[PDB]
Write a protein that binds this ligand. Structure first.
Ligand SMILES: CC(=O)N[C@@H](Cc1c[nH]c2ccccc12)C(=O)N[C@H](C(=O)N[C@@H](Cc1ccccc1)[C@H](O)[C@@H](O)[C@@H]1CCCN1C(=O)[C@@H](NC(=O)[C@H](Cc1c[nH]c2ccccc12)NC(C)=O)C(C)C)C(C)C
Ligand SMILES: [Cl-]
Ligand code: NA
Lengths: 99, 99
């Protein structure tokens, strides 16, 4: 699609068999989702944002669909205020910013 | 332009007579710039995200030139680690996400 920005760029994602809403976020290096169960081992990661840093769980090679596009990559799980699809997965679905 | 997302979408902006680097951020509702002087009255605001909230000053009807494209709107000023161009100005320069 071509997604304009008058509204939040919220799309449906599918992860773990579950549909969720997430923000397509070009300001995010990484993809961060609210607490949920994911398979396998995780590794620690610290991410920084507007209010400081937080610890998240990093899961690699997670199958996730983003607005109907399949991706397989790293998903961080933690106390994010909103599910965020970052550039690691935006690149996998071929997204660009255009003006 | 068409901006791929392999790297952070950082661009040069001009605001308040000053050149700065800022992140084109589709996930941001608002535009937030590091501490600087701007004209007019302001009001305080708390903005949230990863790591919690920071207090900022809200200035209205500010012009920012974003990679050569002028936009006017509300600009927040405060202790952001990264200058952020949010949707309120991305819309004005006709930015879209495409995939
Ligand atoms: C690996 C890593 O940590 N990378 C960082 C980037 C980075 C590199 N060096 C650093 C050094 C220090 C700090 C950060 C970095 C990274 O990618 N961070 C991401 C991140 O937080 N990105 C921000 C942009 C940003 C980048 C860098 C510094 C600060 C901020 C997101 O792109 C950005 O889109 C996030 C997610 C959604 C909204 N939002 C924000 O931070 C914005 N908040 C908003 O737009 C909120 C949204 C909202 C509505 N209702 C709410 C209720 C609760 C909480 C939030 C909300 N609105 C308002 C009005 O507050 C503010 C910029 C205004 C996370 C998600 C991985
Ligand atoms: Cl439009
Ligand atoms: Na599906």
């Amino acid at each position: 699609p071509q997604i304009t920005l008058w509204k939040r760029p919220l799309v449906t994602i599918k992860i773990g068999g579950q549909l969720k809403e997430a923000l397509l976020d070009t300001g995010a290096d990484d993809t961060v989702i609210e607490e949920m169960s994911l398979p396998g081992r995780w590794k620690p990661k610290m991410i920084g944002g507007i209010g400081g840093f937080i610890k998240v769980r990093q899961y690699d090679q997670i199958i996730i669909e983003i607005a109907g596009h399949k991706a397989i990559g790293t998903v961080l799980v933690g106390p994010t205020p909103v599910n965020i699809i970052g550039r690691n997965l935006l690149t996998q679905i071929g997204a660009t910013l255009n003006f």
